[PDB]
Design a protein around this ligand. Structure first.
Ligand SMILES: [Cu+2]
Length: 120
């Protein structure tokens, strides 16, 4: 199946958000990122994607289709706006083995805060 995500300047959660910021998927599903507003992209955060998943980085203002294979959690950011908290969590399969590790990982306070709301 395909899950559609919008990249926006402002959304329910504040400025610079992925909608939805919590994406539940299964191996083989696609995640389509659509920059509704300009100045956004999607990029995998180093060490915040499952063991064996490939790193990715879309072009700014480009529609981007990600195919998810490896089960586990993925924390993706917007390159330009990561520091303002523009992130999304992709959970592939049940009880992602690396979820606790991602929650614990070093990241900007703003990011960490949103991560906490998205998980809740
Ligand atoms: Cu952005």
């Amino acid at each position: 199946e395909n899950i559609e995500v919008h990249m926006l300047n402002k959304g329910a959660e504040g400025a610079m958000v992925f909608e939805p910021a919590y994406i539940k998927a299964n191996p083989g599903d696609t995640v389509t990122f659509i920059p509704v507003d300009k100045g956004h992209n999607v990029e995998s955060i180093k060490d915040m994607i499952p063991e064996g998943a490939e790193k990715f980085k879309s072009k700014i203002n480009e529609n981007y289709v990600l195919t998810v294979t490896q089960p586990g959690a993925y924390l993706v950011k917007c390159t330009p706006h990561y520091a303002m908290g523009m992130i999304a969590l992709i959970a592939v399969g049940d009880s992602p083995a690396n979820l606790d590790q991602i929650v614990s990982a070093k990241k900007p306070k703003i990011v960490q805060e949103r991560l906490e709301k998205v998980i809740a």
